[PDB]
Design a protein around this ligand. Sequence first.
Ligand SMILES: [Ca+2]
Ligand SMILES: [Ca+2]
Ligand SMILES: [Mg+2]
Ligand SMILES: [Mg+2]
Lengths: 7, 7, 227, 227
Amino acid sequence: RPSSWRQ
Amino acid sequence: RPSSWRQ
Amino acid sequence: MGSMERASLIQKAKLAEQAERYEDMAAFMKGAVEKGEELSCEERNLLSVAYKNVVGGQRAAWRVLSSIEQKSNGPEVREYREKVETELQGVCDTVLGLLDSHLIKEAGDAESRVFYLKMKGDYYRYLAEVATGDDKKRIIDSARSAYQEAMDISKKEMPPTNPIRLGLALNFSVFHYEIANSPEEAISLAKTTFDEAMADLHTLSEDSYKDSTLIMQLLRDNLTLWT
Amino acid sequence: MGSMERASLIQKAKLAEQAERYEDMAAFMKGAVEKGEELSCEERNLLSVAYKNVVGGQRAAWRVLSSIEQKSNGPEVREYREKVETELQGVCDTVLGLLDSHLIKEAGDAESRVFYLKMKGDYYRYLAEVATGDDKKRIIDSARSAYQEAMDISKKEMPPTNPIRLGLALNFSVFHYEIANSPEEAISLAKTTFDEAMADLHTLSEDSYKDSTLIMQLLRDNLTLWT
Ligand SMILES: [Ca+2]
Ligand SMILES: [Ca+2]
Ligand SMILES: [Mg+2]
Ligand SMILES: [Mg+2]
């Protein structure tokens, strides 16, 4: 559900 | 460019 | 996949579809085909969806790399395009091998035989998209011959609104436009297919009407692109 | 990849990225790492993007299958979830092996050492997501230890707006919330990270401001989800 780092 | 069949 | 039950391979192909794991899906359906029994309508669709998604991703990658390669004209871009191209050809050869051993020869009903011949036309078309050598004309004629047999059966044995008949005509029209350099043949086929389907819609249930009109819209989209 | 030039592997990794062929990308960057030279900033990003996309697809598939498996509770769903799970663990083990042999021990600069330790925390976190056995606590502590070392270095050596420092804090906060069952730690870390970055934005160029605020927005999105 939560956002981790993404390019 | 043109559409072929797709599901 | 030789040691897995046929029913387990089919079940796992459905799971792989839900997980968007199309390479797994294709391997499971290849294993199911190699059990040697004919495929049901649902099972044929699973086979088709699996390999269409695998080769569809390879075709998309090949076009990206081919475009980069054309703009460049070291060896790396050509080498990597060739690698992707070889893997695509391998997938097409695998599908064609399943059709030839022995799906087509055991397919007696119009619905199955036309489905597999459409498939054979499509995978020769994908081979044609990347072909540049001595056999490119033969590859094109192999696609044409498979599509033509499927068309002849579909016109005698299926109503004009049959979704497989419609999807076959759609793809054979794309073959004419994109591969055979016959855009007038492509347009005529799409228009005649659309018009005869339109005149048969009155015979259909609401659900069948939805199936047929969805593919007719793809024929319309191409005609709008082409005219 | 032993027989390909390092520069050719890097070039092909960039081509694979453009073609969205992330498994190829990861194999090319694995080959580049195995040449034994340290990685540049750009090269580290290519390594990370490649494996994040590969394992990201596996994680998405694992969650689809795990959900189906939970709703079911034959062997097929469990068997296929296990297959995907094993392939994911293999990819995580490969990345961790590259970090351990020998990326981390040769990384002396803050930017490279923090980057690789963040990576080590992330791939242990992905192992933790699927872990259920004797070593699940040890897997969690391995993620925690790598993240903690990276945090300690980043706080001493990098400004609060540094994108790697921000992305590390973002991911360690997700670790706290999702893996360590420490939602208050997750919220406090996200808030303190956001607030100290906000107070340092005035020092940045327009381009650096854009980089930092983009990751701060991800911290904000999580705080909004969590509070
Ligand atoms: Ca038969
Ligand atoms: Ca060094
Ligand atoms: Mg070739
Ligand atoms: Mg397991």
